[PDB]
Write a protein that binds this ligand. Structure first.
Ligand code: ATP
Lengths: 404, 48, 360, 49
């Protein structure tokens, strides 16, 4: 027996994962975005209230790359989480929140202040998302490549503690690919019908412009909300169509390999050939891309090499024996093997280099939350939580005295 | 081999399902329950 | 001997023996505290001296003493069986907190002294009743509706979506529309008569605006209904405007997406690869998912919503209302399932947490 | 006619046998063992030797 009534919250750049300690998978996974309406945050929360079109409702994100951008919207996200998805008043359940290693210490302090003062939870703890991702795989010596929508980062962890200065940050992330497919849409002129108006499916054969109708009842929607929903559509496109070349992108090979088919919400459908292989090469080599191609842009293999190099050789061999890839962008088809070859070239194979296997959507996205679930139920860890009576001074002094 | 010290799978034979399961090692999960892990060894066919 | 399959609905409790085709004992999950304690079968008759509580709201157990009494009634009155001599299969709503499952295991083993127990997800049992390896389950139960994607029998918890309208609030909206009709139904008995009206009359239209036009043009939609008080009323336009609320919750006044839209959402939340297989296998379970024509309305709706390239098939067997209990019976009758029971030894040594070690 | 029926039955039997064998292989595909017994779990049960 090592378990307590612990809830593990893992708020990344795209979705918030809330679940109980010991659970194999997060209980709920609903997006970071949240709705707004005129009077404070008159509201709409998850994938069910954030999608129905509404009279001039606008959608924002209280998060940005993992750092909190609006603590009131964050508080209301948490309130709805507790109210419905976990449907347990928070006054009893110990909680541990995951924060990106590069998130500010002052923001950690303010997060603790909000948590304890308002929600009056009886215990608390903090542990970084990369730390938790390496926590899931059971490996002390690990190197993590986290890549969500808004940011891609590489972080090593040894003895379970991040090399706090050994952080590499690269905007070449899910949003990078999403912008690339956006400019693809524009260049070959996809008209992105949002699914929420379509009411007919007069589909058409390949390439033809499909016919359809828009529902008369629809009210006006702020541009931000429409932008968010079409962004989700193109995210589905990212998941479905994008594929990554095993080796450096080549035009003749990219044309030779069989094309693939994607259909859009309104019935418009199109086939993609070399462009889908070309696009992730932009992540693996920013130079070929439009605009976002300056030498300042750093690709995945260069990112891992930089993160590995900045730390000395007393732990670099440990990083060699395990490369761990997490986050969304690692799910682009054949991304992991491409990264593996890329590092095998960049990093001298002269010494023992291994990857660590993890594939499915549960294992990449929620590996940050799975590590938190592993910690929360850990027997020795039960002593570490910041108690309320401790919090009285801990939220200021021991939120750092305790949680490195 | 590389001599990893933790992956000590071994041939084992159960009693009730009396057969050689192959490479399996024993572990204690949550709640004090002794579990046998397993490998899908390329020797799998030899155990007929 | 036989395994006891007790399905704890959100207002309707179903019980029976493993291997039986239908739940022998069905009684509303009512419990009343006098103004002793009585459960639905007698509680529904004892209202005058009684105040009625429900122990299950939206499929999640509300308080545990009332649910204890519901189980006591189930066994000792409805089934007459000794809990100490039969294995017990319990079903709980998807996304049930860990504490609730642990308390269920505790209550069973401690108070009822069951030898062997198992807690299974209702949606997966409905899939078992359907008999499909992979699928998406739309279970509009007694108090809540759940869209559950299942791959290889494994429910994907991240993609499960809850929408907080179902048969009960739908009946409340029918009471609203029925007052709009000019009648009056406010009392618990009147509410149950409106429930009977819902069961007898309503249907899910194939086209909303078209059926408004038809109702305005034609009086054929009107049908007569006889009340316990002896008078007779006619129900027309209401026969589908209330069921229409399922796909347009705005009719209820609730501010969430409809059933078909939520099914689209759940499908999207799943991995892209298996989305085609989930599309091919959509199962309609639950108590209020058996409206006539609802299957075809769903079919057209998610043919429109989904990519036209993937064949959507709606599976709604004629007795889908009990599909969860039938799945429980199938599971309990399996020889391979027998190794999955939680024995007295395992609870004694591992405690209520054992429910999470082998019983998801 | 009897020769034709006998040959057709031979082919039908062969096809049914191949189908049954395919079904048996498909059965074998699933992990045959998921649990074991308690007296074969907490009593050391074996030595690597
Ligand atoms: N099949 C897919 N392959 C790759 N990316 C995908 C796929 N489906 C969705 N995505 C996008 O990948 C990202 C999913 O990861 P997510 O943003 O949730 O990561 P996270 O765990 O919160 O970490 P981080 O701190 O990096 O944001 C989102 O941008 C999502 O839109």
């Amino acid at each position: 027996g090592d378990e307590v009534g612990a809830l593990v919250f893992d708020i990344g750049s795209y979705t918030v994962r809330a679940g109980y300690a010991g659970e194999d998978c997060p209980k709920v996974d609903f997006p970071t975005a949240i709705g707004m309406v005129v009077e404070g945050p008159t509201y709409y929360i998850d994938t069910n209230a954030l999608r129905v079109p509404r009279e001039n409702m606008e959608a924002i994100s209280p998060l940005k790359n993992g750092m909190v951008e609006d603590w009131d919207s964050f508080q209301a996200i948490l309130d709805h989480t507790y109210k419905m998805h976990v449907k347990s008043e928070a006054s009893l359940h110990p909680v541990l929140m995951s924060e990106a290693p590069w998130n500010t210490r002052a923001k950690r302090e303010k997060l603790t202040e909000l948590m304890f003062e308002h929600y009056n939870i009886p215990a608390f703890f903090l542990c970084k998302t990369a730390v938790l991702t390496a926590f899931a795989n059971g490996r002390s010596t690990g190197l993590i490549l986290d890549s969500g929508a808004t940011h891609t980062t590489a972080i090593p962890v040894h003895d379970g503690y991040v090399l706090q200065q050994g952080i590499v940050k690269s905007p070449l992330a899910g949003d990078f690919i999403t912008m690339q497919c956006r400019e693809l849409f524009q260049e070959m002129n996809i008209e992105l019908v949002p699914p929420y108006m379509i009411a007919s499916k007069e589909a058409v054969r390949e390439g033809s412009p499909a016919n359809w109708k828009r529902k008369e009842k629809l009210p006006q929607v702020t541009r931000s909300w429409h932008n968010y929903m079409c962004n989700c559509v193109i995210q589905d496109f990212q998941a479905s169509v994008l594929q990554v070349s095993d080796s450096t992108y080549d035009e003749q090979v990219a044309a030779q390999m069989p094309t693939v088919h994607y259909e859009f919400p309104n019935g418009y459908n199109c086939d993609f050939g070399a462009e889908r292989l070309k696009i992730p090469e932009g992540l693996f080599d920013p130079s070929n891309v439009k605009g976002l191609s300056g030498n300042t842009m750093l690709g995945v293999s260069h990112v891992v090499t930089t993160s590995v190099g900045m730390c000395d050789i007393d732990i670099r061999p440990g990083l060699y024996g395990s490369v761990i890839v997490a986050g969304g962008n690692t799910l682009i088809q054949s991304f992991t093997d491409r990264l593996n070859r890329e590092l095998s070239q960049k990093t001298p194979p002269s010494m023992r280099l291994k990857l660590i296997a993890n594939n499915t959507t549960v294992e990449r996205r929620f590996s940050s939350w799975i590590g938190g679930s592993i910690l929360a139920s850990l027997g020795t860890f039960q002593q570490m939580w910041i108690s309320k009576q401790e919090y009285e001074e801990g939220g200021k002094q021991c939120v750092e005295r305790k949680c490195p | 081999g590389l001599g990893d010290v933790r992956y000590r799978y071994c041939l084992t034979t159960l009693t009730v399902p009396q057969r050689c399961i192959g490479f399996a090692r024993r572990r204690v999960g949550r709640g004090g329950r002794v579990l046998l892990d397993r490998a899908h060894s390329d020797y799998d066919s030899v155990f007929h | 001997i036989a395994a006891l399959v007790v399905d704890n609905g959100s207002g309707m409790c179903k019980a029976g023996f493993a291997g039986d085709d239908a739940p022998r004992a069905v009684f509303p999950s009512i419990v009343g505290r006098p103004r002793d304690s009585y459960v639905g079968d007698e509680a529904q008759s004892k209202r005058g001296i009684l105040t009625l509580k429900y122990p299950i709201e939206h499929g999640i157990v509300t308080n545990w003493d009332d649910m204890e009494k519901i189980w006591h009634h189930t066994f000792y009155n409805e089934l007459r069986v000794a809990p100490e001599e039969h294995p017990v299969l319990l079903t709980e709503a998807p996304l049930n907190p860990k504490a609730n499952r642990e308390k269920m295991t505790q209550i069973m083993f401690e108070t009822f002294n069951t030898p062997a127990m198992y807690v299974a997800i209702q949606a997966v049992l409905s899939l078992y009743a359907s008999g499909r390896t992979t699928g998406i389950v739309m279970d509009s139960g007694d108090g809540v509706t759940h869209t559950v994607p299942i791959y290889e029998g494994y429910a994907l918890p991240h993609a499960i979506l809850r929408l907080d309208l179902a048969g009960r609030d739908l009946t409340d909206y029918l009471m609203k529309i029925l007052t709009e009709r000019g009648y009056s139904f406010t009392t618990t008995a009147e509410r149950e008569i409106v429930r009977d009206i819902k069961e007898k009359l309503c249907y899910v239209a194939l086209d909303f605006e078209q059926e408004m036009a038809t109702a305005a043009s034609s009086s054929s939609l009107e049908k007569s209904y006889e009340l316990p008080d002896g008078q007779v009323i006619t129900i027309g336009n209401e026969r589908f405007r209330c069921p229409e609320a399922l796909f347009q919750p705005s009719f209820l006044g609730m501010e969430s997406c409809g059933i078909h839209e939520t099914t689209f959402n759940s499908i999207m939340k799943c991995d892209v690869d298996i989305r085609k297989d989930l599309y091919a296998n959509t199962v309609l379970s639950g108590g209020t998912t058996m409206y006539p024509g609802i299957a075809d309305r769903m079919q057209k709706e998610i043919t429109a919503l989904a990519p036209s390239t993937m064949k959507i098939k709606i599976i709604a067997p004629p007795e889908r209302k009990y599909s969860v209990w039938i799945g429980g019976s199938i599971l309990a009758s399996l020889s391979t399932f027998q190794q999955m029971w939680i024995s007295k030894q395992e609870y004694d040594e591992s405690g209520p947490s054992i429910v999470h070690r082998k019983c998801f | 006619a009897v020769m034709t029926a006998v040959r057709a039955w031979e082919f039908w039997n062969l096809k049914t046998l191949q189908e049954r064998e395919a079904r048996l292989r498909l059965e074998q595909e699933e992990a045959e063992l998921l649990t074991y017994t308690r007296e074969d779990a907490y009593s050391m049960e074996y030595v690597y030797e």
